[PDB]
Design a binder for this molecule. Sequence first.
Ligand code: HEM
Length: 445
Amino acid sequence: GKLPPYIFSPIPFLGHAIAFGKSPIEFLENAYEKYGPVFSFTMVGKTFTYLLGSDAAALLFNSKNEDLNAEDVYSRLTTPVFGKGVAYDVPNPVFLEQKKMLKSGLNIAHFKQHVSIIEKETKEYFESWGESGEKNVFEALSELIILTASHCLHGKEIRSQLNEKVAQLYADLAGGFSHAAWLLPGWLPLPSFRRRDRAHREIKDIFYKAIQKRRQSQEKIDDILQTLLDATYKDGRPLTDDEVAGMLIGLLLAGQATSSTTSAWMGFFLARDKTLQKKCYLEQKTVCGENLPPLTYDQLKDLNLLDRCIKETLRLRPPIMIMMRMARTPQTVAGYTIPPGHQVCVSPTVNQRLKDSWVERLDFNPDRYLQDNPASGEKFAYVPFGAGRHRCIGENFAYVQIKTIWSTMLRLYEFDLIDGYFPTVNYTTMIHTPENPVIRYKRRS
Ligand code: HEM
């Protein structure tokens, strides 16, 4: 079996680590041109095989965890932040049971409740913005999305305990998602690691007293906490108070920097394209009514332009750039055999700008989906939340949360660039962030 084409590097251990780190997207696009869909190279003594394009990505998106393993690549980062016994610290079947439990609060019946929760939070938060100014929308959306996801997913006994202190602790635990946490051992006396371990212990404790409060409650609430508190594995094994907390902390942290970056990038795409922005505001009136009543789940699904703007934002600025698995069984793709031991990776970001499939690939064209597009015309060209089995379980909530916030924000304000500056992409963080994300705003009406 032919091994995928390898990119030679004169750098022994680091390999292509630095050239990749500077512009990973340009690195992979150039490799696609010179080497094709499947190629391999080493970074930090690890050998990576990338699957570019829809046909190649199919291998990972259709794979089973026995063949292409997730825990191998993601636990050393994850376990320190979310805690033991949860997510990638447990066998995949046990994780699948945890995932299904979480689904009990990730459905339409609950999303109808979430819409008015998120709208009200968006309004109350942006009270502090006044009538106009120049503020960092990324910092703002981070703070709002913490309060909104804690309210809808964690409950009101945790949301009432949410202050600036606890918001810092969540950012301290988010510091555990570093390249240093991935490569260097976790016990090392490094600053980010101590803040994670310290916050973890403190956040768990806030969650422990909220769990007890509910356990001794007269009435029951239909929400995710209630399920996790009253649920058992098939074995009949109950969840620990530690497991419940970790699953909740992990649920919120998975959709924070993912939703906060996307939400912010869309503002800039809409601030740059002023006519496209007003048309979205016009849709608020046409779909919901001239009185602009409180948003409903049903209304959100009729905001088609806004959906395409969210879709186009996710195409050009997806938060998760690489999806990674470890080869335990030899896999076959494009006539090559990937050897057990290679880390097989797919980049949604690259597949969603591949000149071979995307017309005007670098243009924010939300009407690209009203005509022939790779998102409908290929299986794995548009894969921002993943695909096949390896899909995001929070995708539907991400859409409700982002549509509700931005519907609410569009009603509240009109947005513009400051001297026509569009934020460059900060490639140095795992979730690519916008540089200098200060936006100009004024009151719409
Ligand atoms: C724009 C928003 C979001 C995007 C693009 C996104 C993207 C992704 C992707 C690509 C994965 C797959 C990772 C892998 O299998 O290697 C994933 C998994 C996951 N996401 Fe999201 N996500 C978003 C928002 C959220 C939200 C709002 C939540 C929860 C409320 C969430 C929770 C999760 C969880 C729990 C997983 C489980 C990983 C697994 O099953 O292996 N995400 N997400």
